[PDB]
Amino acid sequence: VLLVAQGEMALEEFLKQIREVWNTYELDLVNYQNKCRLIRGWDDLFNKVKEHINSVSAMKLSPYYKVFEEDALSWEDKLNRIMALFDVWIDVQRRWVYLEGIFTGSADIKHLLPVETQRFQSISTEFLALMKKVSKSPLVMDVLNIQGV
Amino acid sequence: AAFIAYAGYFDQQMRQNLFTTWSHHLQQANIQFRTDIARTEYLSNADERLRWQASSLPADDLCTENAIMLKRFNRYPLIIDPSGQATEFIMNEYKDRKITRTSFLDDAFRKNLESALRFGNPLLVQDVESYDPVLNPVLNREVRRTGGRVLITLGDQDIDLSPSFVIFLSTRDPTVEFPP
Amino acid sequence: VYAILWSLSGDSRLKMRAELGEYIRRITTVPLPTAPNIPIIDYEVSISGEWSPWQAKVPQIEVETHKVAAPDVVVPTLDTVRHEALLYTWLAEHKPLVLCGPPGSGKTMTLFSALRALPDMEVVGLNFSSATTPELLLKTFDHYCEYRRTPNGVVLAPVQLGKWLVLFCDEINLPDMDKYGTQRVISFIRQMVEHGGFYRTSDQTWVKLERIQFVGACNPPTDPGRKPLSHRFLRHVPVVYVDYPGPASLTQIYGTFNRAMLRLIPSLRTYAEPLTAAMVEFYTMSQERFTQDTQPHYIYSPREMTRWVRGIFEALRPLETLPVEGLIRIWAHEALRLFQDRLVEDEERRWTDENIDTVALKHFPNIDREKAMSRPILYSNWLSKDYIPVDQEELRDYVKARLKVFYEEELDVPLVLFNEVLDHVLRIDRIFRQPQGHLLLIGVSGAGKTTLSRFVAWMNGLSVYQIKVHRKYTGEDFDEDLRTVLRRSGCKNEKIAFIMDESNVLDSGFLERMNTLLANGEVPGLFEGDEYATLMTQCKEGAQKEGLMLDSHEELYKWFTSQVIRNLHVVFTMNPSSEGLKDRAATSPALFNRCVLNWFGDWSTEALYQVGKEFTSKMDLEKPNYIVPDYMPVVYDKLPQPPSHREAIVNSCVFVHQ
Amino acid sequence: PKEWIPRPPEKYALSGHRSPVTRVIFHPVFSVMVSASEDATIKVWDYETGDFERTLKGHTDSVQDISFDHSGKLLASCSADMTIKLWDFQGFECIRTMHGHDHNVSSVAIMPNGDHIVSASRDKTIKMWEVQTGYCVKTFTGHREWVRMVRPNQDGTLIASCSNDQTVRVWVVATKECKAELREHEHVVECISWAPESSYSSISEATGSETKKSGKPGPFLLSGSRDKTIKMWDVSTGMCLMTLVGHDNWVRGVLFHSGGKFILSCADDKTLRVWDYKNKRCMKTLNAHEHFVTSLDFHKTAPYVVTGSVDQTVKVWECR
Ligand SMILES: Nc1ncnc2c1ncn2[C@@H]1O[C@H](COP(=O)(O)OP(=O)(O)OP(=O)(O)O)[C@@H](O)[C@H]1O
Ligand SMILES: Nc1ncnc2c1ncn2[C@@H]1O[C@H](COP(=O)(O)OP(=O)(O)O)[C@@H](O)[C@H]1O
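^ inputs. structure came back:
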């Protein structure tokens, strides 16, 4: 029963390490022209999410993984949700920065495209509100706990 | 044992010259040993020979000699074969433990090592001409146990113990100079 | 005539200096000194018209025993006073200097002493790194000077009125060139010295230096890390050749050192001059015997002799009374550990042991060889507190007991002990015990590297730490790892072991910064930002813990780097001299002299015999029906006679390895 | 009586063990002495005559600790197998065993009050235990390395602990933690003492302290290093005033006499030396055995001392 005990201890350590990583994971902030806080380390966050997802998927194939099946399923669901949210948010930050750079240096762009300028201003206000909310709660779990995020 | 651990790199002529030198001088040292040594038949048996021949492996003196070298290794070997069927053999045999892969540009090094040796698996690397630096401490197979948690010095993360672990390495270029 | 000599051969070797002097004597009409067996350079032009040798100007000082091995003020010798005088002559005209010569000659120490003996010139010691920038000089000018405005223009002057601020350049040649064969910092220096000023970055306004000078010193450009200096810069700077001090200078300086050393024991004051003569002739014969052609680490400098003096004084300080036999035993031990430990060949080691025996018998008469010393000369502070010699048997027993303790403590791997591994362990221990002594263990793969060092680091209280490298390994991440290492060493006051292999030296992008770390402790341009602010607040918190008030930025940084250079220990491990693939190829002689080299070599025949006998003793292979051959082929000269079956088997295994 | 220092040579020698000794303890009820061995065994012998009585084995790993109760009706033990065995000296048999540790336990003993038992192991975790229930109720951590030795003071509201991270922390046993830090040592710490019985007057008079109403300013304890030196912390910030030098190897332990007037220490130099701290010099140096000494313990009421060695030999010195 020594091998079974070692496998159970390894699975418990896996769950504890995953929970500790989820609790200690935080969203880095970088100043952007004194307007908002763009997320820093997006590549590192994506790599960490991919590594956690791959580790969970590969660990859900062993013979002694049925002891913490519910915890493994919950961790996999949380990791998938966090990965999807980060994948959406990285594109959101990139597109918002592109739109802000496009519409910031141009003064007659509002006159040329008024509806597009108004839509961009509304999207920029929404992005600023989201950035303020993310800065208020920099924790990854706190950010993911916002309804409708 | 001297042949197994020493004459794994030399060609047939130098290998036999070394064996004859060892045998002649050990005879000069007055130690009892057989003269008509058949080391290949002595180190294996007919059932495993037929198993090897049924499997994808050639059949002559040097190839069966290196085959009996592969069976009872202690350090994980570096096979230099134009065919390259050791990966096929290891996926045929040790598929029961969900073998994983690691190379140079894998985005996870410490996380990959800790997860792999955490839930338990063997390892195998492809394109072995560019060597894998992950393989150094597990290649050593050193032990540092903390009371049920076996850990070795690679990465900031911690690992566990996996009983089933075989490493088979490959080299296509017959003229390379490995690091010392 | 004197200035023509010092201008046309002032950077030339001694034999070519003599050739130029005799050529000047041949073509000249000015009267010259009439002594034939002396060069003209050894004479001096005094205020009076007649010549007078420099030998009548040198003193013979006696320094305290408190400062006998680290003479921040140098011993005034002929070369010291001569180069002091010429530094004064070339410094009073604000021209920049460069002192060139082989490492170990004393250029930087004589430069410090001569440039600090006068109160007019203030000193700002600065070291040039490979990635140095003119922004470093701009920061130095901001700290030590100020921007004042006159109707003529902007003027940069020192804060201290009436003081000529001299900026120091410890390595004027070390900054790397660009892709177009120029060095930006030395072009900046040339611009200052040729225009009398520069242009400010913020205001784009011309400025004018008021009381600023420059002084540099470097190694020859034939060194691997040194570049041919630009002719446009070299047009200004005179060059002085600082050769090795030579036999008269060595005898004078180290006779003074021995006279100030041997004051602790009062009954051996008569042996100071024989000790000086013996050491100087051993040093010069070893230098003549061994050169750089066989191996590139065969450099011999008076830094070896100063380390010798420091070791002798460290051994003699705790001991109340010693005999002449014990004194020359400590002398022989230090000679071994400073000279023959770095040799590669067993023939060379035998030659050096015979050299030590010959030196002892020639220059130490009426002293018995056996009572003077033995063959196993081993010193350790483990078995006893005092630094007294320990014998092989009790040393091996104590190390075996400590190793049995170490098995279940950190690493559970069997080890076999013998003479060479005991010698290597004691050498490693003495290098860790000596502060700032950086160890460099090289040899064949295996052979106990990163195992004896780990064992000694565990037993001496040092915390071992290995280094790993990866792909996409940013200099920022390497600086973060060095941040944790430096914080542990200095801020937390925890000793660390800088264990690394040659496989971690795959990229030279971080090789230069560990070179500067080995040179002067700290590496410039590393930590800047909010992490810099947090580490200085951590440093001042550690200052409060250790009991000093340091709220000042640069003094806190200086205390941090002083703590680090106090408690940082370095051990290198790499293969013998066949690795020309890396950037160094031949590694820097300055790095070799700063470090200390231990040659592990391969396991000897007796080493293989013992490590085979210990491991094979578990099985039962004894044959009572064994027949002893009338002629046994034996390679181990200390085999038992008649050999047993186990002895024959392990001799066969040793022969198989051979 | 009060000046009955140990003197050479030993009046009795025992060689009935098969491994090195770890700890030496006694009993308050009867004149029976017990010890620990590295082969899961305990040796019991008499001092008046020098005859062994029985042995108390049963552990799975090497025993590295032993404790004695003030009432004399309780005992404690520890082993590297993460097990603590409590036995009764009346029947010389085991009573209960409590697990809970995760690494090799270095030392374990019961508190002076007897309500809770401290623990120490390579995992740097102190685990408490119950007597009637046998279940853990309290725990502590914070050490950066393996815990060497921990012992509460006379008051029982403070405990001195040292580790291998060159830092010894003194914390309140009752509720608080991290009262002061003593990191002046440069080597690893091995052992430390808490307080003697008649030590306050000695500290107030001989050392640099106030007279009469000193107010008991903190714990004044020596040792705490292995680089042939000792460090002493007085109060608050832990100023260093007294250093004990003379050990040829790493220190092993420190104790006091019955009257608290003599200082006796043991180390790995294979010699037991008693030095008078008032004279700041060694009073008598004696060779314990031919092997390294691991532990020693001097009897308080009886005028004798004991010593251990790794050569399976135990010597009992005579004090007069
Ligand atoms: N006249 C002298 N008096 C005292 N010490 C001397 C004298 N000449 C040489 N030395 C010693 O010889 C050594 C000279 O080494 P070296 O000049 O290379 O070192 P440095 O002055 O520290 O700097 P650098 O390596 O940059 O030259 C020093 O340790 C110095 O103490
Ligand atoms: N003196 C010795 N006696 C017995 N074994 C040794 C000795 N020195 C080294 N070894 C063995 O060599 C092994 C590997 O260490 P080594 O190869 O020397 O490190 P490195 O590869 O850094 O040189 C260790 O497991 C150790 O057991």
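The pocket of adenosine-5'-triphosphate (ligand 1) is lined by residues C 71, 74-75, 77, 80, 103-109, 170, 245, 253, 302-303, 306 (CB under 6 Å). Strands of chain B lie at 78-79, 169-170.
thumbs up if we can close this ticket
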